[PDB]
Structure 1
Amino acid sequence: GSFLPNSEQQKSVDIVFSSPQDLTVSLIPVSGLKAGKNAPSAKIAKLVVNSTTLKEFGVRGISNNVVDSTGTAWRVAGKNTGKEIGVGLSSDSLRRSDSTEKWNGVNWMTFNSNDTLDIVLTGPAQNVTADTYPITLDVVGYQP
């Protein structure tokens, strides 16, 4: 038998595990909130994230006192008097979360970019005072 060298052909394709991805960002206070003994799991803000069915995003708590490795548990001090209050993503939102991702080692907690993740006073309840309390969130397109 024999091999025909004129019929040889190099053929080529790519196999695609497409990491690339992005996300959208905005945050809204809900009004009608009162001082003193609030409820457990009382919603006070709403991270809004939706778009062309985009897939994941990453988020952390941003303050002087962040208190977790994974991300997403922090405290915030007021403006007028300066008492601290616990804050956090909701207990439903931590079950919606997708992963704990490690940007060059830096943890970020991840979520499907298709939600209204609600922020809550996490704990037992807190006897909060009539005062301002800012919040900050860094948000990132974690790529799957």
Structure 2
Amino acid sequence: PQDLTVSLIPVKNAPSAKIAKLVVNSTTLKEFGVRGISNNVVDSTGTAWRVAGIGVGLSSDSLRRSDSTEKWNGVNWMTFNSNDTLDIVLTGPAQNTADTYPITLDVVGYQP
């Protein structure tokens, strides 16, 4: 399937506790870009941000796998090998509220 199919799968908290898993599938894409969407984003690439019912973002192990950072249409995106699984974690030190929290990711793929 050439077409992009994207899955976001749910997983005092542990340091870097994993909270969600991102999978992007396509038989034709080589790479994809992903950014978190927030009112309170905490870097150029949107790979760490704050979420209103906590600090969330890609894990260091996921960030390590980025192929490049590209500026596309005025915005920086970290790119990753297609069919990859990336982890979304609570970032920074152990974070301490019984609530529902919204997590929004935007994914882009440019077909070969």
Per the TM superposition, whether the score is higher than 0.5 is: yes
Distance 1:71 1:21, change over 3 A: farther
Ranges in structure 1 where 5+ consecutive residues have no aligned partner = 1-19, 31-36, 79-85
How far does residue 131 in structure 1 lie from its aligned partner after superposition? Answer: 1.2
Normalised by the length of structure 1, the TM-score is 0.69
Distance 1:22 1:99, change over 3 A: farther
C-alpha distance in structure 1 between counterparts of 2:26 and 2:59, whole Å: 22
Q: Is the 8 A contact 2:29 2:110 kept in 1?
A: no
- Deviation string 1:14-55 (CA, Å, 9 cap, x unpaired) is xxxxxx98743121112xxxxxx2111211111112332631
4+ residue runs over 4 A deviation: none
- Deviation string 1:50-90 (CA, Å, 9 cap, x unpaired) is 33263100011101101111221111000xxxxxxx00011
How far does residue 105 in structure 1 lie from its aligned partner after superposition? Answer: 3.0
Q: Is the 8 A contact 1:63 1:75 kept in 2?
A: yes
C-alpha distance in structure 1 between counterparts of 2:7 and 2:83, whole Å: 13
Q: Is the 8 A contact 1:21 1:141 kept in 2?
A: no
Q: Is the 8 A contact 1:93 1:118 kept in 2?
A: yes
Q: Is the 8 A contact 1:88 1:120 kept in 2?
A: yes
Two-structure CA RMSD over aligned residues (Å): 2.3
C-alpha distance in structure 2 between counterparts of 1:92 and 1:22, whole Å: 27
C-alpha distance in structure 1 between counterparts of 2:49 and 2:85, whole Å: 19
Q: Is the 8 A contact 1:22 1:141 kept in 2?
A: no
Q: Is the 8 A contact 1:25 1:49 kept in 2?
A: yes
Q: Is the 8 A contact 2:2 2:28 kept in 1?
A: no
C-alpha distance in structure 1 between counterparts of 2:61 and 2:83, whole Å: 14
Distance 1:88 1:65, change over 3 A: same
How far does residue 107 in structure 1 lie from its aligned partner after superposition? Answer: 0.9
How far does residue 138 in structure 1 lie from its aligned partner after superposition? Answer: 0.5
Report the 3-state secondary structure (helix = DSSP H, G, I; strand = E; otherwise coil) of the residue aligned with 2:64. Answer: helix
C-alpha distance in structure 1 between counterparts of 2:68 and 2:2, whole Å: 15
Greater radius of gyration (CA):
1
